[PDB]
Symmetry: D2
Subunit: 264 residues, 4 copies
């Protein structure tokens, strides 16, 4: 089973990048499952109904989210009405939407779990205990189990990866908008990467207009929230899971930008 995962989509530039390159990536890699983190898709934060459908149309089988899930209130109008949208599972009981979805595509089934870290972030429920709960639930239905862990601290991300080794098929990090080079398969067969990175402006600061972000750092004064425009980048991973052993056997990084040309 092959999974293609695309990191945090940031605003229209990210959406444009998805529209162009996900179909090409799908042609190139022929993944059984395609997952996209859309937490910044609506002008940099949150999601609209139109955007959810356009991301699906671009080739996503499921969409994962993060700390900005709720930033556009319109999400409350459609979240329980669409089939393949996941938000962090460790938001308190009673939160709208779901933290796990079972993606049925190309004759297979992948459990897709979204979790959010707590270091440097709001005090949600414990994602470690939540991971245990959802992994055991998922395992009753499918041995293919994928986690998008949206977190800030490298320590917390690596801890979750090691903690779930051999129990989740793959654990990929998102949130920091910078792809890491530590993609590897852990000793018990779980594919792991600390952060997949972002899809959106390449020459902003994490997708945001450079001048505003630098001004905030230098002045401590508030600035307008402004998404960058210009060159674009896409960040993703392709993960292969052995259908017999259920272990991950490969995790390859994808980067497409002026410094990493796309081939084929």
């Amino acid at each position: 089973m092959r999974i293609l995962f695309i990191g945090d989509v940031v605003g229209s530039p990210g959406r444009d990048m998805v529209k162009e390159y996900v179909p090409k990536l799908k042609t190139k890699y022929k993944p059984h499952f395609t997952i996209i983190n859309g937490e910044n898709a609506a002008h940099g934060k949150g999601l609209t109904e139109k955007i959810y459908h356009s991301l699906i149309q671009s080739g996503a089988d499921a969409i994962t989210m993060g700390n900005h899930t709720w930033d556009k209130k319109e999400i409350f109008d459609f979240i329980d009405d669409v089939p393949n949208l996941v938000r962090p599972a460790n938001f308190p009981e009673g939160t709208p939407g779901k933290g796990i979805t079972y993606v049925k595509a190309n004759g297979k089934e992948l459990a897709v779990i979204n979790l959010q870290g707590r270091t440097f972030l709001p005090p949600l429920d414990d994602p470690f205990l939540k991971a245990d709960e959802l992994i055991a639930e998922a395992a009753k239905r499918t041995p293919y189990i994928f986690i998008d862990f949206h977190a800030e601290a490298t320590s917390e991300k690596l801890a979750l990866g090691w903690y779930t080794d051999g129990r989740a098929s793959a654990v990929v990090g998102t949130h920091t908008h910078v792809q890491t080079a530590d993609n590897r398969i852990l000793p018990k067969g779980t594919a792991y990467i600390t952060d997949v990175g972002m899809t959106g402006p390449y020459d902003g600061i994490l997708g945001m207009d450079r001048e505003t972000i630098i001004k905030r750092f230098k002045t401590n004064l508030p600035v307008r929230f402004t998404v960058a425009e210009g060159k674009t980048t896409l960040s993703g991973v392709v993960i292969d899971i052995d259908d017999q052993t259920k272990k991950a056997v490969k995790i390859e990084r994808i980067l497409i930008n002026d410094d990493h040309m796309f081939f084929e």
Copy 2:
């Protein structure tokens, strides 16, 4: 000129990794300057006099530091006796030691500057204005200017890189202990990477014993400070600067571990 930079050395396993591989890297790449971040070298945090000299002996020309600079109070006894130890320049005026040093090779001086980020970290002086001050001062003396920015937030690291583009020759990030894949040359010629990564245990959590760190996440109870033992890793970069144009022309990542074997 060519610069070899080695990421956060963690404890004795990190020191062992440096002792073996830094000489081999110098043979392979023949850098004019070698810089090592030693902030975790003394059993996970801080530095001793013997360890400083041992790192120099392994091939370092200068040692940069970070938030753990002062964790072993012995440092106050030797900081005035060692010649090329740099700590974050933005600690308050009156802090022992220095934030910039100059090393010379093949007729050219390299200014080596250490700065520390403030997001998710203590409120030091502003590293942006400090960078301006030190860049201006160094530029009176040499156009070759290297910054090791020890910081947590990707936003802050990228902001500094872009902010100093064309003024610093290279800006590399440290602190998170995970190497990033975003090594690039910015438009005005500054080499940049968000985090070089760490040198030390490969199968801990950021160098720390896995069990202890996972227990702390799950229990919220204190745990003993325990550096991991086992497989090791080294993370670094090799940066080339064109000495005619003063622009960086290449930044290559170095990873040495069981997933990235070293070849002479």
Copy 3:
């Protein structure tokens, strides 16, 4: 019934203050229950078995704790074996000790609950849901329910007080080591104060040596952990609950120091 509560006891000076004044307060006010927060009692952090017994001897019927509960490791060997010691209830399931205790004394019964806030503190379990859970447990047995909420943020403390109004008999804040002047009875009858304050050195910074604390603020460098010498202070509240209506009818602040002499 009447409750006497004494705020965070800090080190030996705090213990000395308790030894001298708690017996005098008990004579003056004749409380049915006396509760003391002991979280800093052992040289500024944690609790030893010897000090637990000493606080009981001085007149405490129950001892509540806080973020420093685990700092003196001997607590792991007595916390499960002594009566009426509680730690914050919202540490994860499996944590040693109890977060609720039932005190029978001077003829009546009181449920004493300890909780810890999460703003500016570690990500424990949600204290709001935990408060619901423990109030419902206590309300199977007794209508008299007291909460010591150990928290940093005024917003979080007030929120819990208002949230539990009419359900808890009294909710008092601890942790910031400064008594607040906002003692009041909330509309549904719950006695409330944002912070009771501390018991210990009066001329330190929250109990700590002034020069060490000031140095840390000015230099960002490490300093010795040192409990302050000199004048001492005690902070507390006395709360009256109507035995028929269950409403609190008075909450009076106690301050004993050079600026607030004690009158027998």
Copy 4:
């Protein structure tokens, strides 16, 4: 010399309390100087020109601010144009407005300084060194020196009070919206209180609608920014400085609400 200081004015209910009670307070105490913190005055955050004038109209001689100074953008067009308005002095050089002002009354001049803490807040310039700089400036012009320190952490507030003892005439804290009971004259003659409290709704959470704040704590979801309806409160202090010794000799707390009726 007598100073009347009014704590954070929150929204229209805060403005209503000021309009009614500041004149009554000025009649009762006959202060030479009246200072109001207006940082939340414009619908809960920031300050408009109209409100600036209305606070002066109500009896203020000088207005101090805090972390919300910049929230109503019109402030950028009047801050440099009106008298006796100050913002935290430790915003970086080049920030609009000023951090110190001199108010004249009778034959006396009062230096009014505003500073902002950094613990749990943005990384501004160090307020300790900034205090040193401004006190030294002020002392050449007048021995009457007042500091409004807008900060979250009790340790930081107390540290500044003690640090400046005998150099500032008075140091009062703001920002946490809860009045503290620790008003005192420090050993070298500086009047001190950790937090003066707020002026605005009494039955909100720090002035905000209770149900919205409780919801945010329980759900971790966004809530609308809503100033609370209902009964109101005013918080202040009255400080006396001996005109011969220049020591503070008294600091009295003011509370006006249903639990503290106003006389005269």
